[PDB]
Design an enzyme around this catalytic site. Structure first.
Site, PDB file in Angstrom:
ATOM      1  N   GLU A 179       8.083  -1.178   3.893  1.00 18.78           N
ATOM      2  CA  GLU A 179       8.103   0.047   3.103  1.00 18.78           C
ATOM      3  C   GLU A 179       9.359   0.162   2.251  1.00 18.78           C
ATOM      4  O   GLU A 179       9.329   0.817   1.208  1.00 18.78           O
ATOM      5  CB  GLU A 179       7.983   1.261   4.013  1.00 18.78           C
TER       6      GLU A 179
ATOM      7  N   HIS B 219     -14.515  -1.573   2.575  1.00 18.77           N
ATOM      8  CA  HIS B 219     -14.228  -1.838   1.175  1.00 18.77           C
ATOM      9  C   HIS B 219     -15.470  -2.079   0.336  1.00 18.77           C
ATOM     10  O   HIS B 219     -15.346  -2.235  -0.879  1.00 18.77           O
ATOM     11  CB  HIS B 219     -13.307  -3.043   1.050  1.00 18.77           C
TER      12      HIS B 219
END
Ligand SMILES: *[C@@H]1O[C@H](CO)[C@@H](O[C@@H]2O[C@H](CO)[C@@H](O)[C@H](O)[C@H]2NC(C)=O)[C@H](O)[C@H]1NC(C)=O
Ligand SMILES: *[C@@H]1O[C@H](CO)[C@@H](O[C@@H]2O[C@H](CO)[C@@H](O)[C@H](O)[C@H]2NC(C)=O)[C@H](O)[C@H]1NC(C)=O
Ligand SMILES: *[C@@H]1O[C@H](CO)[C@@H](O[C@@H]2O[C@H](CO)[C@@H](O)[C@H](O)[C@H]2NC(C)=O)[C@H](O)[C@H]1NC(C)=O
Ligand SMILES: *[C@@H]1O[C@H](CO)[C@@H](O[C@@H]2O[C@H](CO)[C@@H](O)[C@H](O)[C@H]2NC(C)=O)[C@H](O)[C@H]1NC(C)=O
Ligand SMILES: *[C@@H]1O[C@H](CO)[C@@H](O[C@@H]2O[C@H](CO)[C@@H](O)[C@H](O)[C@H]2NC(C)=O)[C@H](O)[C@H]1NC(C)=O
Ligand code: NAG
Lengths: 597, 199
Positions: free
Chosen positions: A358, A488
């Site tokens: 991150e 997805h």
């Protein structure tokens, strides 16, 4: 009025007015994702529905300058992004029909239950009900019940809804100038800029198939050892020795990651992996020393420090008020110079190798911040997560962990515990490379009309035995929609950006571990205290989308294309160990044996 | 000769870091131990001069800048920390003898009033079609976005465009007592040294 100059005027006015509206529409989402309520839910929608109207007015304005007259580069690379309208080119009722179909499919996938034959009142949702049966159990019939139940319950309802979505999205991408909806997804990899760095849309289909033939002598050694370890558990009558694996015995509902097979296929089960979580909790590491020791990494390789408001505006731990946050790590870039990380951090060695991920996202976000508005992303869709994952590859070695006293100083690197680490890496990395290639190839072939409507379920299991090497346990017919049982596929997401970023973060690491003067195997490299490998990473992070991805890849590596040779140089000792272990076994499979016959 | 009284430093409200007030003194008798006894000094980092021999030298000019500044961000005024402070708000001159004090203004100092927020700037640029053109600060000079930021900031990351330039503020509230910062710099004379201490 010299159309390039009118385009310059329009882009200057857009860059002036598009910064106050895109910051409010991201602050209204930060104030919802960390403080989930109803008033924040109203403010997020009513502040994100002005930005879409402004952006659509900008697109209708920008579809007036023909881009065959603008002879600049960054004033032709932005008119072409603003002319990419999207789904809003349809008639005003087919857009509502498309929204109806694309929301009904997502709700059908979300509220999906399987009820068992023993007690029909007892039913199980996917998360977190079925992904413990299909991740912990070693029972054949229970896994077959869960797999066949999920397929027969969320495939028969999504087969007639995936046939209208194809017909509508082959019209959305036909009124935009592309040929089908495969080209509309593949045109993220295009380049017609300066010279020699040109990439067509149709080169990606052959580049993916050219890279896969390099990763398929290694997958055939992995799928001849995993098969033997499964034969040693389930039995020789259920699993053969020259056929494919049945689909439900893969540690997953869809067989994407093989990571849950590590309890069965571990090479040396007496040598444990390194775990510093006991050494972190017995040395008083809070949830802030993790983020302040993941910053002395980036300041050591040569990148930037964090801002001053990053430490008081971010949410680096789950709050103890009545706030109900969503605990999923994301790294935000809100606009006018503020970068925030949302994460529910606890003291483990899995929130230690996610602070580096991150932070590698916002160290990318902090670098291209001089680029106008539209040229603020990775060079394609796979660049932004490849540089977030070359930080977790070097923040986990047993020298970077030993320099923080999270390990005993009299370590010995334990020869078996590098094969025990490379196999755990390979089941995640090489286990998903045939899957994300086969699913995307099937989607590209059913979108362009190479696979007609009467053979989807036939060609899916015809390709899943030739590419992946996985056979079906139950005969299927033309009423099932087995691809649409994935997240997805039902929620309209591109899936090649997971294949073309497992290839980029070894071309990156083989260059950064060449600049840092590393002599040894690639799986124990360390870009720490090395400014020469942070001065050439900053030549990539600085650009944004101002240069095409071929030039931005040549500036780092030295070769402006994809390559699978660094992946095979990473998995080099594992390959030599597997070729000793698979001695006298049939490498490969024959696609004629079936568990139902 | 006369008194360089520090009355404007000890009255009103100390300004933010970008709008720093300057108090260049000349031709007087000074006593910095009178000044530093009124505060709770938390740092005395000096460059090319010593804190023991500063208070009694004879110089030609004596420059004092002061602004309201929280002492938790004391690592952003240091040299070689290219943050959002030394780029846009204030960049300290080093080609002269200088010091840097960070005080912790007591409540028994009744004449100094308290502001509502601390504040600085996060960017000051010049927009175009090719992106942002950043306007970094010169050493010892004000920011080029000074006449733009003199309207007032009300929230975090509130920007102010006017034609070409575009500045952006950032505020956060004051907790406890007030904290300031005094960037004291001298210059050695050549002919007449009129800045000599009070004895
Ligand atoms: C979470 O969101 C709620 C919105 O319902 C916040 O509640 C309001 O917050 C504003 C902020 O100044 C106050 O002015 C209102 O008086 C609050 N109204 C109510 C009914 O509570 C809440 O404060 C937010 N929580 C946090 C920690 O920011
Ligand atoms: C799109 O172009 C139109 C012009 O066709 C812009 O509309 C003008 O906006 C300015 C804003 O300062 C007004 O002063 C004009 O009166 C408007 N003219 C007309 C004919 O409406 C519009 O702002 C542009 N939008 C974007 C997002 O660039
Ligand atoms: C990166 O560099 C730092 C500083 O050179 C190294 O930290 C020192 O390591 C030695 C090892 O003998 C210790 O004696 C020092 O006390 C350490 N200093 C500090 C400030 O930590 C660090 O080990 C290097 N990291 C790697 C991975 O090589
Ligand atoms: C300069 O200001 C100080 C402020 O306190 C004056 O006071 C003396 O400060 C020293 C500091 O160590 C003390 O030791 C003395 O006892 C203080 N004296 C008095 C009378 O309070 C100091 O007098 C001033 N200097 C001159 C030359 O007047
Ligand atoms: C990033 O922040 C660190 C804060 O630890 C800065 O390190 C300081 O650098 C100055 C420069 O002379 C030293 O005097 C300090 O001693 C350092 N701090 C510590 C705790 O050792 C670093 O300079 C910052 N880097 C950038 C690029 O801003
Ligand atoms: C101010 O000074 C007086 C006398 O020295 C003392 O009693 C008082 O506590 C001081 N004020 C504070 C806030 O400490």
């Amino acid at each position: 009025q010299d159309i390039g100059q009118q385009a310059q005027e329009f882009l200057e006015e857009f860059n002036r007015r598009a910064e106050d509206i895109s910051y409010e529409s991201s602050l209204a989402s930060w104030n919802y994702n960390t403080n989930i309520t109803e008033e924040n839910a109203k403010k997020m929608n009513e502040a994100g529905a002005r930005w879409s109207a402004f952006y659509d007015t900008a697109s209708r304005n920008a579809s007036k300058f023909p881009v065959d007259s603008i002879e600049d580069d960054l004033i032709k690379l932005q008119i072409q992004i603003l002319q990419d309208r999207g789904s809003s080119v349809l008639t005003p009722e087919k857009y509502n029909r498309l929204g109806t179909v694309l929301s009904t499919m997502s709700t059908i996938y979300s509220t999906g239950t399987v009820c068992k034959i023993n007690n029909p009142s007892e039913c199980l949702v996917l998360e977190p009900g079925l992904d413990a049966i299909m991740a912990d159990s070693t029972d054949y019939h229970e896994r077959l019940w869960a797999w066949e139940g999920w397929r027969a319950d969320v495939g028969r309802m999504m087969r007639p809804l995936y046939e209208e979505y194809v017909e509508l999205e082959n019209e959305v991408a036909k009124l935009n100038g592309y040929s089908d909806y495969g080209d509309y997804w593949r045109a993220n990899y295009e380049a017609d800029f300066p010279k020699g760095y040109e990439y067509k849309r149709d080169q990606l289909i052959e580049d993916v198939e050219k890279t896969f033939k390099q990763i398929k002598p290694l997958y055939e050694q992995l799928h001849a050892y995993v098969r033997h370890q499964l034969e040693q558990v389930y039995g020789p009558e259920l699993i053969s020795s020259t056929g494919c694996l049945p689909a439900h015995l893969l540690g997953d509902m869809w067989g994407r990651f093989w990571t849950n097979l590590y309890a069965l296929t571990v090479p040396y089960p007496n040598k444990p992996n390194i775990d510093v979580t006991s050494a972190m909790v017995e040395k008083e590491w809070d949830a802030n020393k993790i983020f302040r020791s993941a910053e002395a990494f980036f300041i050591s390789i040569g990148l930037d420090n964090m801002t001053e408001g990053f430490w008081r505006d971010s949410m680096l731990t789950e709050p103890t008020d009545n706030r109900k946050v969503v605990c999923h790590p994301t790294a935000w870039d809100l606009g006018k110079n503020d970068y925030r990380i949302k994460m529910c951090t606890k003291v483990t060695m899995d929130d230690f190798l996610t602070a580096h991920h991150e932070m590698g996202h916002i160290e990318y976000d902090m670098a291209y911040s001089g680029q106008p508005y539209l040229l603020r992303s990775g060079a394609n869709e796979g660049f932004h997560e490849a540089v977030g994952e070359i930080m977790s590859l070097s923040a986990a070695t047993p020298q970077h962990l030993k320099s923080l006293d999270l390990l005993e100083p009299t370590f010995q690197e334990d020869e078996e515990t590098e094969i025990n680490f490379l196999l755990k890496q390979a089941l995640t990395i090489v286990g998903t490379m045939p899957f994300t290639y086969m699913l995307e190839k099937w989607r590209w072939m059913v979108f362009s009309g190479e696979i007609t409507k009467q053979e989807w379920t036939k060609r899916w299991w015809d390709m899943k035995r030739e590419i992946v090497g996985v056979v079906e346990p139950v005969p299927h017919d033309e009423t099932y929609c087995d691809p649409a049982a994935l997240f997805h596929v039902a929620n309209d997401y591109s899936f090649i950006r997971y294949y073309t970023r497992t290839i980029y973060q070894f071309q990156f690491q083989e260059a950064l571990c060449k600049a840092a003067n590393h002599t040894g195997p690639l799986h124990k490299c360390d870009i720490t205290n090395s400014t020469a490998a942070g001065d050439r990473l900053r030549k990539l992070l600085e650009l944004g989308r101002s240069k095409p991805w071929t030039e931005a890849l040549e500036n780092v590596t030295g070769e402006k294309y994809m390559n699978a040779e660094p992946l095979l140089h990473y998995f080099e000792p594992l390959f030599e160990w597997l070729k000793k272990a698979n001695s006298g076994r049939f490498i490969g499979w024959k696609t004629d044996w079936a568990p139902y016959s | 000769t006369q008194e360089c009284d520090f009355t404007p430093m000890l009255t009103g409200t100390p300004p933010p870091i970008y709008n720093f007030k300057r108090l260049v003194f000349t031709n007087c008798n000074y006593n910095l131990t009178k000044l530093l006894s009124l505060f709770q000094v938390s740092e005395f980092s000096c460059h090319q001069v010593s804190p023991s021999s500063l208070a009694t030298g004879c110089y030609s000019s004596l420059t004092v800048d002061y602004f309201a500044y929280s002492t938790d961000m004391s690592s952003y005024l240091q040299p070689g920390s290219a943050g959002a402070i030394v780029q846009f708000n204030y960049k300290q001159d080093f080609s002269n003898p200088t010091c840097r004090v960070l005080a912790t203004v007591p409540q028994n100092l009744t004449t100094i009033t308290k502001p509502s927020n601390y504040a600085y700037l996060t960017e000051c640029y010049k927009t175009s079609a090719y992106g942002k053109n950043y306007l970094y600060n010169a050493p010892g000079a004000y920011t080029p976005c000074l006449s733009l930021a003199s309207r007032g900031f009300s929230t975090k990351y509130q920007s102010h465009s006017d034609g070409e330039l575009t500045t952006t503020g950032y505020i956060y509230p004051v907790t406890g007592n007030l904290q300031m910062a005094f960037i004291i710099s001298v210059q050695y004379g050549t002919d007449t040294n009129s800045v000599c201490p009070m004895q």
